[PDB]
Fold this sequence. Notes:
Four copies of one chain form a homotetramer.
Chain A: H1 3-10, E1 28-32, H2 37-48, E2 52-57, H3 60-74, E3 78-82, H4 88-101, E4 107-110, H5 125-152, E5 157-162, H6 166-169, H7 175-194, E6 200-207, E7 210-211, E8 225-226, H8 227-238, E9 249-252, H9 256-261, H10 272-278
Parallel strand pairs in A: 1-2, 1-4, 2-3, 4-5, 5-6, 6-9, 7-8
Bound molecules: NADP nicotinamide-adenine-dinucleotide phosphate (4 copies).
The site of one NADP nicotinamide-adenine-dinucleotide phosphate (NAP) has 26 residues of chain C, from helix 2 and helix 5.
PDB class: oxidoreductase
Keywords: short chain dehydrogenase, reductase, selenomethionine, oxidoreductase
Assembly: tetrameric
Amino acid sequence: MNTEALQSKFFSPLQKAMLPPNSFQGKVAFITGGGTGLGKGMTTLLSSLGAQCVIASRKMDVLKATAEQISSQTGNKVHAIQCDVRDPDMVQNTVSELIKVAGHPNIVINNAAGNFISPTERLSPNAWKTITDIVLNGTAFVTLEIGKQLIKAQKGAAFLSITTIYAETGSGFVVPSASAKAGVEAMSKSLAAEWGKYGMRFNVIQPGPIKTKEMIGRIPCGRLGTVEELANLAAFLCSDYASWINGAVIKFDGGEEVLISGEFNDLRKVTKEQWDTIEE
Amino acid sequence: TEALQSKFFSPLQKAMLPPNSFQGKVAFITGGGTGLGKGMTTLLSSLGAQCVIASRKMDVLKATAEQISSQTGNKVHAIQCDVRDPDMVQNTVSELIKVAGHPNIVINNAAGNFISPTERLSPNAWKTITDIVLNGTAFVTLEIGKQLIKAQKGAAFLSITTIYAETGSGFVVPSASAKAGVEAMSKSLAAEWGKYGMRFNVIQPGPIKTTGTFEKEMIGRIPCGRLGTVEELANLAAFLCSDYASWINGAVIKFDGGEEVLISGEFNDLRKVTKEQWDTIEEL
Amino acid sequence: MNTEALQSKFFSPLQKAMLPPNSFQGKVAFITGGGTGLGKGMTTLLSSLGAQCVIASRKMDVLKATAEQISSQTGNKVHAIQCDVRDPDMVQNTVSELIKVAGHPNIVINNAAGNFISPTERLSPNAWKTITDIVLNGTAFVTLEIGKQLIKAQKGAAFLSITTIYAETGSGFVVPSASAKAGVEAMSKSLAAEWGKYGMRFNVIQPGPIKEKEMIGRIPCGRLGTVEELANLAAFLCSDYASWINGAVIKFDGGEEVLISGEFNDLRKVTKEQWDTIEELI
Amino acid sequence: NTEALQSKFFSPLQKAMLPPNSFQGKVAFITGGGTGLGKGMTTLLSSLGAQCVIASRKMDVLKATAEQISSQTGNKVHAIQCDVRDPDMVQNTVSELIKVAGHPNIVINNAAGNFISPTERLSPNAWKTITDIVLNGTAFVTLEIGKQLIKAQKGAAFLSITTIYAETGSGFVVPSASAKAGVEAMSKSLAAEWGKYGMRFNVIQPGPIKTLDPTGTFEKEMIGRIPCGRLGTVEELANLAAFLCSDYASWINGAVIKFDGGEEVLISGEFNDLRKVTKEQWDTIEEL
Ligand SMILES: NC(=O)c1ccc[n+]([C@@H]2O[C@H](COP(=O)([O-])OP(=O)(O)OC[C@H]3O[C@@H](n4cnc5c(N)ncnc54)[C@H](OP(=O)(O)O)[C@@H]3O)[C@@H](O)[C@H]2O)c1
Ligand SMILES: NC(=O)c1ccc[n+]([C@@H]2O[C@H](COP(=O)([O-])OP(=O)(O)OC[C@H]3O[C@@H](n4cnc5c(N)ncnc54)[C@H](OP(=O)(O)O)[C@@H]3O)[C@@H](O)[C@H]2O)c1
Ligand SMILES: NC(=O)c1ccc[n+]([C@@H]2O[C@H](COP(=O)([O-])OP(=O)(O)OC[C@H]3O[C@@H](n4cnc5c(N)ncnc54)[C@H](OP(=O)(O)O)[C@@H]3O)[C@@H](O)[C@H]2O)c1
Ligand SMILES: NC(=O)c1ccc[n+]([C@@H]2O[C@H](COP(=O)([O-])OP(=O)(O)OC[C@H]3O[C@@H](n4cnc5c(N)ncnc54)[C@H](OP(=O)(O)O)[C@@H]3O)[C@@H](O)[C@H]2O)c1
């Protein structure tokens, strides 16, 4: 059959829970940006598999509503804590409350981000600093505080930062996000090294476009990704099955990065008969 | 310092995927008779895959294939193959298609290695390694991919490289070279062969447990405070080859307890500095 | 001869100007951190080669001294402008003055930085933010503003960021620095792509230690780098000879990174005799 | 326009950059030294006073090139016929280089082969051919010279010319991508392993250099994927090469330098296809 048909058949999304039912029982997970999109799906999955989840972002209204919706769908309590990650104090309070309404985290997911798609020359210094403050410093502040607390309590945890495929390569039009996300990856590798003795491991997922256009033409897998597929990868990495996975960076992109980065991949349209002529 | 690594980095050596999730699937694994290849085969079979293993020592292949087959109640076929021979490779692919069917899961795991100063290697010692690792994976990939294209079928491919494939390393230079080539190939065919329903991923393992003072000094360079286990690696591989990972393609996953990040970080040697010593320096 | 002497003989530094005399004439160069160390060195050589340099940093005291010290050495004028790169207002005024006293820059070197060596546990959120600010945001503010000006003027420039080898790998004990430096690298790569249409190119050097014994055991070249060596590479990259080099990341480390990052490089101390033995067991 | 902005500011400086006679008394061994990039690198190193030795399969092209450069520079260029994928020829070639010129201070592994083809249409022999020339060839050359340098207690600067797709991989050039990546790994490995012997190892990753396209339009489309707005030149590359092999770079070791006009960063950045968007089009998306 055709490209699109092989792509649909052989890269069909398995959108159901992967890990053993109740595998996260007695584990507490903390998800920045847990109220929407990717953060939500990851919460929904960790909750649905038995974790006690704490979610944190700016908008309490959406945060409470998401927690409620998941809590009633899974049976397990999702707690909402209002937090702007770029504020150290709100972060300290959020860690303080996290440790009261659940206990010390076993799973830390840094997923809260901001982004502007714009020509860089149209960005103001403030627009730049904002993205940097949310992505880079916000992840640092959350990691710093939780880290400091886990050391004091002699507990360990699995940390997971969600970045993006352009974190590695750079990209025009998303410059402060590329820079801050690169910062986030370097931080993960830095702390995977530093904090092993404390029982803390640090991994990264770099997603391509998740369905939550014809970017599909740049994806070998011929479709956008799904939230549930991603959550599955996140759950695996934060699971005990992955206790030896540390300092890793996993592309979740249907092959988008390797495709666009390959010099001669712009030949993928070239037809069979054109190929016969080219070899002449 | 080690009881934190004992409890919080404790290995989970049981099967993670759901029972019979690999029913109806066929797995082909080079080096499937020993170490990691065996552990991977063991897991896939216990999850209901019809496994086919391939390497040179047929006696080990059959023993292993029989041992797993009796423990899981699913058939493990053995095929003798030197991966660096295209003709033997052709046969093997053919025999696999006849006795099991087109593979849904292809795992290149067969390797060879010298640990030696590079100046002590002959040209042939160098060429041998390149042959088994690079050309061998390529030959397996080429033929299988040609059959899958003809049959209008697709598969998940997986290559086991190493943490030094990305960095290079003295003393294992031909292996580093060939393995880097393998990673490049995977990323290349993730891009080229997506259209045929083929995806390609890579695991980079650190030291997996396969006077005893060398093991101790190695662990000193591992943040996770221990070597990996075959079972843990097997779960990562199954995941990567499972339908749960059908949007994972061109990925390169370090499975190393954090070794690469530790040794590569310029100031990581400062992990020896003591808490009281830091007080002296923080005053300066 | 032994290792140390082979290393001495074949890796000897060439600490003199490399490019043709007066090859940077008619060029203006802006260097942050250009008052001390690596930035000074790069300023000296560009000045010695005919560029009109403008250096910018916090401390006016050390800046003016340096800018005088170099101007007396080379003859060419080196201007100093007091600037904190984490302050976008001061950056805006600094760029404005740069253009008024020298003109639009042809070379832009983002070199100002700050660092702590510390267990990450002992960092306050404020200590972290400070490194992030000077390094990532500062470089972005300087780049943003000059870029905006160069686009307005329809002129182009070579940009150069000095990062470090751990920007790519991460590293414990220098964590905010690694994160910000990494951010600086992604930025260069992003802008090389975005701003090619405006005639701006973006490159990066990652230095290892530049002029202790512990490292030299981890440096295959067997010595620290020198400021004049690094300056030559900077000058090259900022010259018209490198007009087709864009988005590049050059390690200048005597091999330190490849040494430490290689799993089996810890076997470097294994002796010929032990090597004879090790092969007998395999 | 944009091309007038790029033409003015990324303008190629196609002339020697290193000081006259800076390579005097240095011997350089360049594989593929008779043609394309190898020729340009040979020409320049000779022009700067190096005793160059070039090597490749075709003695005729080799001799012609060697003579042509020797007459241009008054400096001696010797040809030695060599198939790099043949270990015994490599042995004899190195032995010949030592006798006719001396131990090399500069070694440039430039010889290559490539096929542009769908992978499915390659035979195992087509695949293996490329691996042999690019990976095994560079290795045999490096192995033998390095053995000789260690014996003699001399060091040298090694340079390997790869490609931007060696790090990323790329469809349609898969054997090359694989073999080139192996070459990069080798350079990094030997920078660590052989620094103690006075050997350093670096890599250039070139994008498209000026010398399939009957109309001229494919080259035109290629330029669109290049931030710098042109292809590179041999002379430019040769200058980067000479720099990396000069004593000025005696502290550069294990480096990998893209020379590509910014192509690799442009094609690899997820959102870079947004460069097509006009100013007005942006004036709507930001108004949302
Ligand atoms: N979806 C994709 O295709 C895609 C692609 C690549 C990468 N990603 C990555 O995936 C992650 C999740 O993104 P998404 O698509 O689900 O939605 P998103 O647009 O990134 O939403 C951001 C989330 O972070 C929270 N947030 C924003 N600012 C915050 C702050 N200052 N403090 C605390 N929380 C804050 C938001 O909640 P509040 O508004 O309540 O604060 C929101 O839930 C991000 O890291 C993103 O970079 C997504
Ligand atoms: N174990 C570790 O700590 C570790 C560390 C880093 C990387 N790895 C990687 O993990 C993979 C598995 O290796 P291992 O550790 O299980 O032990 P190993 O000794 O490397 O396994 C080699 C396997 O490959 C097969 N093989 C060798 N040459 C072959 C040839 N020419 N044709 C076909 N098959 C061939 C062998 O079977 P026959 O002898 O019967 O032919 C054997 O099963 C390797 O790719 C290795 O690079 C492992
Ligand atoms: N030296 C090495 O061995 C080495 C190794 C690896 C990387 N590097 C990199 O090389 C570069 C050069 O550093 P260096 O060794 O010469 O000294 P450094 O201490 O790393 O750089 C400090 C310089 O930057 C200026 N600076 C600091 N904060 C500033 C601010 N907020 N605004 C404006 N300027 C500021 C300082 O001047 P003021 O005090 O007046 O502000 C000083 O001139 C740095 O980017 C560093 O990251 C150096
Ligand atoms: N030109 C570009 O735009 C570009 C772009 C990316 C990368 N590169 C790289 O730059 C380098 C030079 O390339 P090029 O374009 O000048 O020509 P090329 O086609 O890449 O290389 C051909 C050269 O290699 C020699 N050679 C081929 N097979 C050989 C063998 N079996 N043993 C010894 N020598 C052999 C040839 O000499 P004989 O025919 O006499 O044997 C010829 O001089 C190559 O490594 C290439 O991969 C070039």
